[PDB]
Design an enzyme around this catalytic site. Structure first.
Site, short mmCIF file in Angstrom:
data_model
loop_
_atom_site.label_atom_id
_atom_site.label_comp_id
_atom_site.label_asym_id
_atom_site.label_seq_id
_atom_site.Cartn_x
_atom_site.Cartn_y
_atom_site.Cartn_z
N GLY A 1 1.16 -1.14 0.03
CA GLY A 1 -0.09 -0.13 -0.11
C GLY A 1 0.74 1.62 0.13
N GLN B 1 2.92 9.90 2.09
CA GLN B 1 4.30 9.15 1.98
C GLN B 1 5.30 9.92 1.16
OE1 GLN B 1 2.51 5.69 2.02
NE2 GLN B 1 4.26 5.78 4.07
N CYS C 1 5.57 -0.05 7.46
CA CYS C 1 5.36 1.40 6.82
C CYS C 1 6.70 2.17 6.12
CB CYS C 1 5.30 2.37 7.69
SG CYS C 1 4.06 4.16 6.87
N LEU C 2 5.98 2.25 5.01
CA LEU C 2 7.36 2.49 3.59
C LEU C 2 7.88 3.86 4.67
CD1 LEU C 2 5.72 2.57 0.64
CD2 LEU C 2 7.20 0.76 1.58
N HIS D 1 -4.98 1.29 7.03
CA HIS D 1 -3.25 1.86 7.24
C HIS D 1 -2.99 3.29 6.41
CE1 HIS D 1 1.22 1.36 8.26
NE2 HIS D 1 1.35 2.40 6.50
N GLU D 2 -4.27 2.94 5.44
CA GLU D 2 -3.70 4.49 4.11
C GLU D 2 -4.52 5.76 4.35
OE1 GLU D 2 -0.62 3.66 2.67
OE2 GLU D 2 -0.45 1.75 2.60
N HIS E 1 -3.10 7.54 7.02
CA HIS E 1 -2.07 8.40 6.35
C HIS E 1 -2.90 10.15 6.00
CE1 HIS E 1 2.45 6.68 6.84
NE2 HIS E 1 1.84 6.08 5.72
O1 LIG Z 1 3.42 2.29 4.57
C1 LIG Z 1 2.89 1.54 3.94
O2 LIG Z 1 1.34 2.45 3.56
C2 LIG Z 1 3.30 0.58 3.36
C3 LIG Z 1 2.70 -0.47 3.81
C4 LIG Z 1 1.43 -1.17 4.43
C5 LIG Z 1 0.77 -2.12 4.80
C6 LIG Z 1 1.77 -3.08 5.25
C7 LIG Z 1 0.88 -4.20 6.21
C8 LIG Z 1 0.00 -3.74 7.24
C9 LIG Z 1 -0.78 -2.45 6.59
C10 LIG Z 1 -0.45 -1.56 5.80
C11 LIG Z 1 3.76 -1.59 4.06
O3 LIG Z 1 3.70 -2.26 2.74
S1 LIG Z 1 5.17 -2.37 4.71
C12 LIG Z 1 6.64 -3.18 4.11
C13 LIG Z 1 6.08 -3.93 3.55
O4 LIG Z 1 6.77 -4.52 2.91
C14 LIG Z 1 5.43 -5.37 4.62
C15 LIG Z 1 4.61 -5.02 5.09
C16 LIG Z 1 3.50 -6.40 5.23
C17 LIG Z 1 3.68 -7.14 4.80
C18 LIG Z 1 4.25 -7.69 4.22
C19 LIG Z 1 5.42 -6.61 3.18
ZN LIG Z 2 2.50 3.39 6.09
#
Ligand SMILES: O=C(O)C[C@@H](Cc1ccccc1)C(=O)SCC(=O)c1ccccc1
Ligand SMILES: [Zn+2]
Ligand SMILES: O=C(O)C[C@@H](Cc1ccccc1)C(=O)SCC(=O)c1ccccc1
Ligand SMILES: [Zn+2]
Lengths: 153, 148
Positions: B49, B54, B93-94, B135-136, B139
């Site tokens: 996401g 961001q 989170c990125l 989560h998005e 943000h």
């Molecule tokens: O900050 C963001 O929005 C990106 C984020 C979204 C997110 C992940 C997990 C739960 C809710 C929202 C990420 O992609 S975080 C890093 C990641 O690559 C990842 C995290 C969890 C599972 C798989 C990948």
């Molecule tokens: Zn995030």
């Protein structure tokens, strides 16, 4: 061409320090479309300049486009602009702002600035601005640094 | 396709209420290029996401792209409905690199949003995609997951 919504005084986006544009953004359809939509927004409001924060983009892009009321100047788009030098000579001039639509005033500006910037293609340019164009450059850079012209009166 | 610089925790851009996208911007090259840069930024970071704040864009645009699903871009998303049933999942989170934590989310959410073309649409998410939607949206409202 898209006319974007403009942030007004009181909105927090206008008070941040805008982030520099990365090298991989240079010469991109993304950067051309951002500048085109900023240009259209500026013309819609009969502005002589615009900064990305004013359209909710916290990035270091400005447009300077003087006209007399001073050169008649087609918009120059400045990516990551940096003022290297402000002249010792200082003049007072009338300013308005698209983010403060209800007020105009007298602001003290450097009569000339030496400005280094990137074109949308990523070419490095250094130019000295005089007079009204200098005032517009200083105004737009202030937007990138979270400053409105009313704070300088 | 452009990869955009990503704001990190402690940058003030992450703390604002993002502005709604205008009618002028729907079905524009501008808005397509924004969604495309956001998509590329998310893929290069191995994200599932991303929200416009961001990448220093204070606009209400999110991408949800999980299990497997085709990426969905949402303009001006609103959560209209959610389950009392809570679940707990690991989030990162990125914008908060090398931070991992359990967060309580609704297990189901119904989201109204505009397409990039400007068509009003509703969708229901369950499980991991529902966590990502929440989560998005956080943000867009100036909230980082570390606060939950
Ligand atoms: O900050 C963001 O929005 C990106 C984020 C979204 C997110 C992940 C997990 C739960 C809710 C929202 C990420 O992609 S975080 C890093 C990641 O690559 C990842 C995290 C969890 C599972 C798989 C990948
Ligand atoms: Zn995030
Ligand atoms: O950046 C802005 O907010 C737009 C702005 C730029 C500016 C005008 C005058 C001095 C410095 C910077 C405007 O275009 S406001 C309206 C305008 O066109 C104008 C204002 C005063 C005198 C002449 C024109
Ligand atoms: Zn201004």
């Amino acid at each position: 061409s898209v006319v974007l919504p403009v942030a007004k005084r009181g909105e927090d986006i206008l008070k941040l320090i805008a982030a520099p544009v990365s090298a991989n953004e240079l010469n991109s359809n993304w950067l051309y479309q951002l500048a085109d939509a900023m240009h259209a927004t500026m013309l819609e409001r009969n502005g002589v300049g615009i900064a990305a924060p004013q359209v909710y983009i916290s990035k270091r892009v400005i447009i300077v486009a003087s006209r007399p009321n001073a050169p008649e100047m087609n918009a120059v788009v400045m990516v990551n602009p940096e003022i290297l030098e402000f002249s010792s000579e200082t003049c007072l001039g009338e300013e308005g702002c698209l983010s403060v639509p209800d007020e105009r005033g007298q602001v003290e500006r450097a009569e000339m600035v030496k400005v280094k910037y990137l074109t949308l293609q990523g070419e490095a340019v250094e130019t000295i601005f005089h007079g009204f164009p200098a005032r517009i450059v200083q105004h737009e850079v202030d937007h990138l640094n979270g400053i409105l012209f009313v704070e300088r009166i």
